[PDB]
A paper describes a structure:
The first step of adenoviral replication involves the interaction of the fibre protein and more precisely the globular trimeric knob with an attachment receptor from the host cell. Desmoglein 2 ([name]), a newly identified adenovirus receptor has been reported to be used by some species B human adenoviruses including HAd3, HAd7, HAd11 and HAd14 for cell infection. The intermediate portion of the [name] ectodomain, consisting of EC2 and EC3, has been described as important for recognition by the HAd3 knob (HAd3K), the trimeric globular distal part of the fibre protein. Here, we report the structure of HAd3 fibre knob (HAd3K) in complex with one and two molecules of the [name] receptor.
A second minor complex harboring two receptors per trimeric fibre knob was also found. Different population of particles with either one or two EC2-EC3 modules (HAd3K/EC2-EC3 and HAd3K/(EC2-EC3)2) were identifiable in agreement with the 5.40S and 7.34S species previously reported. Their 3D structures were solved to an overall resolution of 3.5 and 3.8 Å, respectively. In the 2:1 complex ([name]: trimeric knob), the interactions of the 1:1 complex are preserved, with the second DSG domain EC3 interacting with the G–H loop of monomer ‘A’ and the EC2 domain interacting with the A–B and C–D loop and N-terminal portion of the D strand of monomer ‘C’. In the 7.34S complex, one of the two EC2-EC3 modules is bound similarly to the corresponding one of the 5.40S complex. However, the relative positions of the modules differ slightly in the two cryo-EM maps (rmsd of 2.585 Å between the two EC2-EC3 modules) likely due to the binding of the second module in the 7.34S species. The main difference relies on three extra glutamates (E146-E268-E299) from HAd3K, which might be involved in the second module interaction while they do not participate to the first EC2-EC3 module binding. In the present structure, however, the interaction surfaces are different and the 1:1 and 1:2 binding modes are largely dictated by steric hindrance occurring close to the three-fold axis of the HAd3K, likely resulting in less favorable binding of two EC2-EC3 modules binding and extensive clashes if a third EC2-EC3 module is present. The structural data confirm the biochemical data since clashes occur with three modules excluding the more commonly observed three-receptor per knob binding mode observed for other HAd-receptor complexes. In addition, the non-classical stoichiometry of the HAd3K-DSG complex (1:1 and 1:2) results in non-symmetrical binding of the receptor to the trimeric knob.
Author numbering:
A (entry chain D): 108 to 135, 146 to 194, 206 to 224, 228 to 291, 297 to 331
B (entry chain E): 108 to 134, 146 to 193, 206 to 224, 228 to 233, 238 to 291, 299 to 331
C (entry chain C): 130 to 219, 225 to 239, 245 to 318
D (entry chain A): 130 to 218, 225 to 239, 245 to 318
E (entry chain B): 130 to 219, 225 to 241, 245 to 318
Write the structure that this text describes.
Amino acid sequence: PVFTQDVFVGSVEELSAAHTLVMKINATKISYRIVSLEPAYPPVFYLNKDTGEIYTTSVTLDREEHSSYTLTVEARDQAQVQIRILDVNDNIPVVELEGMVEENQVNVEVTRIKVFDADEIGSDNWLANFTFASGNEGGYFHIETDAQTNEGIVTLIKEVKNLDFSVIVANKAAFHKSIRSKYKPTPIPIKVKVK
Amino acid sequence: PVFTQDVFVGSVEELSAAHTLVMKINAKISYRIVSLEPAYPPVFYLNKDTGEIYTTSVTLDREEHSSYTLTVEARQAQVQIRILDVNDNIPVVELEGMVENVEVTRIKVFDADEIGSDNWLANFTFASGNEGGYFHIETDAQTNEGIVTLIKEVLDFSVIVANKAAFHKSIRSKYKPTPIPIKVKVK
Amino acid sequence: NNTLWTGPKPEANCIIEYGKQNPDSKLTLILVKNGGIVNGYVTLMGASDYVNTLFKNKNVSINVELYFDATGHILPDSSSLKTDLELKYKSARGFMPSTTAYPFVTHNENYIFGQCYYKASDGALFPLEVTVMLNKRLPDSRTSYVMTFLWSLNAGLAPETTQATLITSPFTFSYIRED
Amino acid sequence: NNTLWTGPKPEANCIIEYGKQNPDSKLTLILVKNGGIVNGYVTLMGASDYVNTLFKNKNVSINVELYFDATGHILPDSSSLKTDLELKYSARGFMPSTTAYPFVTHNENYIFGQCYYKASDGALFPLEVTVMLNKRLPDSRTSYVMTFLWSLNAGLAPETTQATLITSPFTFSYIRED
Amino acid sequence: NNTLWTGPKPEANCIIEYGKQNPDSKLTLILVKNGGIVNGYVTLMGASDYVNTLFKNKNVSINVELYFDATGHILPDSSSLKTDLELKYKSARGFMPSTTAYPFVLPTHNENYIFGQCYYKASDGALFPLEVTVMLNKRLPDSRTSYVMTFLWSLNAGLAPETTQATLITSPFTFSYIRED
């Protein structure tokens, strides 16, 4: 009848398949019933009333529209469950250029490209990775991702005319199966003048 | 050989299906369309016995032509058909504001429908960042601008833009909502 | 015999410009009985000038309607196919869609959607959205079965500039038949 | 006899409400013999409040699983069809092949198609359907496995009200067992 | 008996990489006669290294020809299926595509094509859409043959579907044509 804990902390992943096991709550014949969710209008979780298991159901999840769930159950003959949705990679990083170099300058900053990725801030699914397309053949520029606010800062390598180029955007971790084979690489260029 | 009126009017929906009744002209009379002012597509088919203008197998578009003036003889007269716009053409946004109830930003957009109507007004929602309660929206209708105003005096957020009314049955189930970021600065 | 023909290469028997009095487009339509369903084959070839100058536009909806009777022959006065459908080796109610699973009457369990492709003359490939509507309606009192076809096309770039012939990819589909 | 019906227009015989004992959604499934293959016709109509209010949400994955035994009569205890199929007038020949779709990776047990959902005002939403043949085993008394998966992700909601979940008729063809 | 087989899961019989005599892929092709048409079932499976290293690129095309003869068998000297097709319960003039609906032309012509779509489920579960262009007669290789049936799978992806080597299996494609009585 009575329960064994008060905070059953578990997790499940974003955009997962239906009827994956979130967690298995436990209590010391019993029958299980959810009495409240934190969002009332989307029914997202299912309580298996036989063995005390939490499943996802036919409508799947999204972490970006609602990040963490808190839901109270009660068994008959209350206690709180705190479910955090683990973020998987989804929607493509989008890009919003000019810069100036000089004669024989070494390792100087040209541009700091901004990028709005709509994923979880801090993780490997928001950190952008910028790869070159055409213009950096002879070893001219290097790219780093500053992880303070996701800045694709470029810098010089050699010491150097209108040598403009282009960069291609991706996340640091690879894409999901639900977003790849729709991601088309559009290389948005970068213009730079020597002086 | 004699009509009843001189200037006919009518209204047909933009992007409607074929064989819909546009208007019913009147004057056995064999009704005979002889000229259109936009002449290269035959968009209107006149049923010769009854004078019912129908939309044939090629469909219309308001954004190319909003008024078709066609002259018809009943064996002369004018026919002036106007097009009622439905809501295709998803809006597009061409965005930084610093604070210290002061308005922050001004968001200028560009629709493509009839200017003034409720298929032109950009209605601005909230996507990720107003859970602190900092921005209230305002749709400046007379020039279609997304004004925001402060709520709680003291961070960035994003806006999902849509029209005032719901979209058409064709451009929905293709519209992917892309969030658009606004960066607010504070001193 | 279990094949309702139209012709492997038929002549002009279908009108597309609504209001002509001579047929101007060929329509190939093959129905075959298969167990409890009917498999279908349908394509459309424009064989005039106006139908061949349809795809210079960017939004085109081509409608082709068929109205059978209780026996199962096309009434050509009110249909849009101006030639009866003939058998192969020899009552032809067995190829008609069922009024138990697609009843007359909203009620959008009648439609069957799908796709074909138009191969443009410059190597381009455009998708055409095919809507095959079953019974759904009664135009007359003597009409007992309805089957309509619709080729919708919306495209940004214009498909053709000069006049080529109109030819669509074949379409295959299946429906529950009347016994 | 060359048809496995469900009825032309049945009552509810599937279960999508995960944890109900009574059926709440109808589906029409017709399998016909044709030479070396079997043609298949399938559509799914909702018949309760939870099934009709699925498509107020963006992402919805409907899953219908069928477990035929050694003969071919559907086990109504572990499947999702709670009513077995009937002939038009055993039923081993309609079941899929085991030397073409073997058990256990092994991505040859799938047939990928596409169907449509006519919305409340009508907007032609594309549903991606996946027919997984056998590939798995619940226990040691089921012999053949079939699974339909109707997946939908969308830009906006299909409908903000409850109308009916009626999907388009999907057609397929698989290799049959002798 | 109304089924032109190839095998439910046969050995390697098809050949891509023209310039080779080792059969390097498997091809299940089932053509079932039905009324006045022929339904089909096409499945291409990888069975060697060169077919499996194709999808490391992004704009690829896999071509298969079937040049029949005057009576309905496959000429192995010119086609790309070096194994004759069989019946189910053993003349195959009935399963050939029709020459009065798909006629032979000689100099464009576009009334004897079939378009379709299949899918490639990758190594991590990502569906890639492949286009299928089933071309009936349209052409003639030489004077020995009498019917032509070609298949072609094109893919123009955005990224690479694979990096290592896996068995290139396509989704089964279904189609129908008019037969020659």
